[PDB]
């Protein structure tokens, strides 16, 4: 029984390029497949941006309650939460929840702007020891996912490490760490992705992403039953510009790497 | 015609029974498939229980804030939220969110006890004009889903009509209808079911269900992009006790009934 064989078979049969990094926090062990290749993050980058604003809030203690104007011109495909508040305001906490738990691209843009642009999200990544991540565009163009383009990419291994530090480690202050985890656990978009490959009894927080080239991503923190948590990154992208999403590939990869 | 033939084709390759009821609120049109047969509700019954508690909160002011004790003996499969509060408390708002947005079966049992048992949830259904719904057992046994058993069943037609009345109609007070819709839109478990058959721009609130006999259910309110909402019930059950879940079949049914 061979995890590399299974992942290579999934990838080949899918017609795409699959990247996987698992961290088992029980013993610091990893399962890696194309873990040092760059992939387009798409909306999985919203974790870094929300965590950056959380970090800000450790020193601007009322920042999460700050109202932010939502104008009709701010609407970008998709905006299921912000469209309801156009011509009004949303707080940075509401925006962070919207960006994380829903598909909300306008909410992401407000986080980016709060951080002073894409470079602000990259600067946070650098501050917490992630030298791989880069954010260079706003929404929606950060999702173009063109093959060979390094913009708005990271590697599975780096993002697994970062997500571990953010959700289980000490990148954030305790309240901010707990907030992030509460938001990820309340994600609405994830049941077809990593979670579909796992036993139903396991608890998952996750952020999904999807863009050009059939790019289909998920990053997750997982609590198996009375076991130590796992961090799992599954990235996937395809050769055709308009390929269909493949959440089932991410599910299949999550089952392969957690079986046993 | 086209639709009916396609649903039958789907059903014939699915290895089970399929029940569908779509209400298009633009014109009150319906698309029905086995819509007067009984199916096991499993966790889709949590909608009726949360709504009955919302109804109670119209007259017991502050009911949703009321803390309820969680003890070890209360834990039933699955309990992702209630487990964190064992030897502690959850408020009726937290138990309603827990039951709606996650898998949590302990949270449902507390809603049922707040209503005076399974029969109190059936009484509420009757109070809002549903003469079909019938809750007869607590969690987890209400999910046995044995073929032929009338316990804990409804029909697609009745459930679609009830969900319309609850979410879009006047079965509840306006503040409480809005709370129900907010909870449903925040479901975490739905992305592989009805939602997986719909365009990504459409906004969905939904409640899934699973149980014995490979029972795989979803009931949803759907807001297509700048169109009047849809109600969709998709129920599915299989002939062998230990059959696997078929969320894909629900997604496929949703795509068939909305393609027109
Ligand atoms: C987060 O991952 C957001 C992705 N957005 C894109 C998608 O494919 O879902 C679009 C197309 C909505 S965005 O216009 O790039
Ligand atoms: C809601 O629909 C919950 C159903 N629960 C069951 C499932 O199939 O997920 C179990 C098996 C967890 S419960 O013990 O019946």
Automatic annotation (TrEMBL), chains A, B:
It comes from the Bacteria. It comes from Escherichia coli. Transmembrane segments: none annotated. GO terms for molecular function: beta-lactamase activity. One of its GO terms (biological process) is response to antibiotic. PANTHER family: BETA-LACTAMASE, BETA-LACTAMASE-TYPE TRANSPEPTIDASE FOLD CONTAINING PROTEIN. Keywords: Antibiotic resistance, Hydrolase, Plasmid, Signal. Its EC number is 3.5.2.6. NCBIfam families: bla_class_A, blaCTX-M. It catalyses: a beta-lactam + H2O = a substituted beta-amino acid. Residues 20-234 form the Beta-lactamase class A catalytic domain. This is Beta-lactamase. Belongs to the class-A beta-lactamase family. It holds the Pfam family Beta-lactamase2. InterPro entries: Beta-lactam/transpept-like, Beta-lactam_cat, Beta-lactam_class-A, Beta-lactam_class-A_AS, Cefotaximase.
């Amino acid at each position: 029984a061979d995890v590399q064989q299974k992942l290579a078979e999934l990838e080949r049969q899918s017609g795409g390029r699959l990247g996987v990094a698992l961290i088992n926090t029980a013993d610091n062990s990893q399962i890696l497949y194309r873990a040092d290749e760059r992939f387009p993050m798409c909306s999985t980058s919203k974790v870094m941006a929300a965590a950056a604003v959380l970090k800000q809030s450790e020193t601007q203690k009322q920042l999460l309650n700050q109202p932010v104007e939502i104008k009709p011109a701010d609407l970008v495909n998709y905006n299921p939460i912000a469209e309801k508040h156009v011509n009004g305001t949303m707080t940075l906490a509401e925006l962070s929840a919207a960006a994380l738990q829903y598909t909300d691209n306008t909410a992401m843009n407000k986080l980016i702007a709060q951080l002073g642009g894409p470079g602000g999200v990259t600067a946070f990544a650098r501050a917490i020891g992630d030298e791989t991540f880069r954010l260079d565009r706003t929404e929606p163009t950060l999702n173009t996912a063109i093959p060979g383009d390094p913009r708005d990419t990271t590697t599975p291994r780096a993002m697994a490490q970062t997500l571990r530090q953010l959700t289980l480690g000490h990148a954030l202050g305790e309240t901010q760490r707990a907030q992030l985890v509460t938001w990820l656990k309340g994600n609405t978009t994830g049941a077809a992705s990593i979670r579909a490959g796992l036993p139903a009894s396991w608890v998952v927080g996750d952020k999904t992403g999807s863009g050009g080239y059939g790019t289909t991503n998920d990053i997750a923190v997982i609590w198996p039953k009375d076991r130590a948590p796992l961090i799992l990154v599954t990235y996937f992208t395809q050769p055709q510009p308009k390929a269909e999403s493949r959440r089932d590939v991410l599910a299949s990869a999550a089952k392969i790497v957690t079986d046993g």
